[PDB]
Each structure stands twice: as C-alpha cells, then as structure tokens.
C-alpha cells in the first residue's frame, strides 16, 4: 500500500496536481515508504503544493535518510555543506555524503572525494580522495573515474601507475564521459599505460569528439592529417578540425587558417 501510495503521487505530480501529490507523499511518508518521505521534501524544497520552505525540505530528507534513501542523504549532505535550508555545518555534511556513499550513491562518494581533493572546508588529504573516487568510480561515476584517473597519472594520494590511470580514463570514456575519452586517447597516442596503439587512440578521440569533446576532434584531425591512425586523409580531417574549433579548440581555429590552400573561381 504504501508503495502503492508513492504511485499515486508520483503521477498526481505529473499532472502538476501538487496538492493531491503531498496528500499521497505525506500518507506514504507516515507509512514509513522512504522514497515517500524524499519527494515530499521535494515538494517543500520546490514550494509546489505547499509554501516553499528549505528548512522543512530539510527534515523530510532527513527523514527519508534515516529510512535509507541513498539520495536523501546526499542532498542533505548539499544543505549543509551550502548552508541551504539549514545552517553551515561541514561536519553535518561529510556525515550525510558518507552515508549516501555508504548506501551506494555514487555522488556521495564523488562528494567526499571532491572535498579531500580540494581542501577548501578540510585540509586537503589526496588519500581520500583517492578512495572515495575509487568508490565512486566503481559505483561507474563517470566524472568520478577520470578525476581518479588524473590521480593515478600525477600519483597523488596512490602510487603513480599509469595503466591504473588509463584504465580509469577508459572506463570513464565507456561512461560517456569525454574529458575521459580524451585523456584515453592521448595516452594511447603517446603510449602511455599501455604500448602505442594509433588504432585504439583513434576510438577514443572518436567517441570524445562524437561527444562534443573540442580537443577530441581537433587530436583526431591531427590523426587523419597525418595518416598515423588511419591510411590517410585531409578532406576530412579539416572537417574535425573546423568542429573542433567551433567547440573551442585554438589549435584547430589556428591550423585551419593555415589550410586555406584551394584553387579559386
């Protein structure tokens, strides 16, 4: 029934009618049905049904944190770190984002990692950063992914391994993360964590610039321009090259200036 109840709600929601939607949420929420719990904070959060109000948001997370919801841990964990709704309290925060890391929710653990990585409301600890980005790499993360492969190249808060590192990027790239697929191809165009592979790199670049990755596109012209992963070809490799700079690559704005050779009529 209470399941059954979060139904209900959930489709009230869609049809914008809020009003039954929190009726449903509050009745399933009172059944302890924690995804019941969330979305009324999410109605409080968004003022739809009800009069806006973050600090009330704030407890119905709460609530559904402690009735396990994953992703009520983890926004709570935002309020606090913020101070949105409820007051500042770094503390506060790193408890709720563990939590969420510990249910499984692959952006606690990004969250964790992000704030041992930066140092801003913690002193900086690249260790946990790299085990939390493990974590959120594993729960496939894909930001998380990169940025742990970024830590196994430059060997901060783990031993530099390189094949770690690409394993990471590549892993990132299966996630669609493109800054992944990019890193990807550049180590396997410079043959770095694994032997020199122009074919392989080749994919990558590919994918990041299907992607919409500028440098993604602008490394695979390069490619074609100089027949190293493929046989040959200028004609479209200078098609890479002009998306490549239309997504912000300099170095394919640039050289495309300089491949204005064409007979004229």
Same mark, same amino acid.
């Not at 309290?89 to 992000?114: F, H």
């Not at 901060?156 to 690409?166: F, S």
């Given at each position: ?45 968004? /003022? ?25 841990? *983890? =926004? =709570? ?7 949105? /709704? ?75 391994? =390189? ?11 299966? =996630? ?5 697929? $990019? ?7 410079? /043959?770095?964590?694994?032997? %020199?592979? $122009? ?27 100089? /027949? ?31 491949? %204005?050779? %064409?007979?004229? *009529?």
């Amino acid at each position: 029934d209470p399941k059954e109840l979060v139904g209900l709600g959930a489709k009230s929601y869609k049809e914008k009618d809020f009003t039954q939607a929190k009726k449903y949420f509050e009745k399933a929420c009172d059944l302890k049905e924690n995804s019941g719990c969330f979305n009324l904070g999410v109605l409080y959060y968004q /003022g739809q049904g009800v009069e806006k109000n973050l600090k009330k948001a704030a407890s119905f997370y709460a609530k559904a944190c402690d009735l396990n919801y994953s992703n009520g841990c *983890h =926004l =709570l964990g935002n309020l606090y770190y913020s101070g949105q /709704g409820v007051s500042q309290n770094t503390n506060k925060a790193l408890q709720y984002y563990s939590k969420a890391c510990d249910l499984k929710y692959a952006e606690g653990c990004a969250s964790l990692g992000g704030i041992y990585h930066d140092g801003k409301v913690v002193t900086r600890d690249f260790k946990k950063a790299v085990e939390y980005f493990t974590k959120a790499c594993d729960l496939n993360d894909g930001d998380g992914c990169t940025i742990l492969g970024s830590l196994y190249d430059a060997g901060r808060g783990t031993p530099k391994d =390189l094949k770690k590192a690409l394993a990471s990027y590549d892993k990132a790239c299966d =996630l669609k993360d493109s800054p992944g697929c $990019f890193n990807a191809g550049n180590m396997y165009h410079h /043959g770095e964590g694994a032997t %020199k592979n $122009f074919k392989e790199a080749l994919a990558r670049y590919s994918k990041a610039c299907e992607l919409e990755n500028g440098g993604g596109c602008f490394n695979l012209g390069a490619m074609q321009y100089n /027949g190293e992963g493929v046989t040959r070809n200028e004609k479209q490799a200078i098609e890479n090259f002009k998306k490549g700079c239309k997504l912000g690559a300099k170095g394919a704005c640039d050289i495309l200036k300089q491949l %204005k050779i %064409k007979v004229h *009529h």
